[PDB]
């Protein structure tokens, strides 16, 4: 057994943010998006395919099947859904110190993207734990 799920996503907005340690930092940024973006008249949004593998999170477009960009999910630290909205999604990828926010939207599937990755990141974990 494997995992590759592919999820349909649209790309809100992203912040850099302190590295901090908890997913409060999600929620407070996820805010601060909406409200900039309505704020400021802006109602566009990116669509893509979200993929979740053991390896990385990709973002990747519809169409023409091209990925647009890829997280290692060693770095993906921080990931939650907005528990009074599972329409949204974000993550904090933390380089080696360095933090980005990224916020999304998704077809109500906020909850199913975090256990993938969850599980996506102990499927990692025991491809490392193993010979």
Do not use: W
């Amino acid at each position: 057994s494997i995992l590759h799920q592919l999820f349909i996503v649209r790309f809100l907005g992203s912040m850099e943010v302190k590295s901090d340690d908890h997913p409060d930092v999600v929620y407070e940024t996820m805010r601060q998006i909406l409200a900039a973006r309505a704020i400021h008249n802006i109602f566009r949004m990116t669509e893509s395919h979200l993929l979740v593998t053991c390896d990385c999170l990709k973002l990747i477009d519809p169409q023409t099947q091209v990925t647009r960009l890829t997280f290692p999910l060693p770095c993906v630290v921080l990931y939650a859904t907005h528990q009074e909205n599972k329409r949204l999604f974000g993550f904090v990828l933390r380089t080696s110190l360095s933090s980005v926010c990224y916020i999304f939207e998704s077809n109500n599937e906020g909850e199913k993207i975090c256990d993938s990755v969850g599980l996506a990141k102990q499927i990692a974990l025991h491809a490392e734990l193993d010979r």
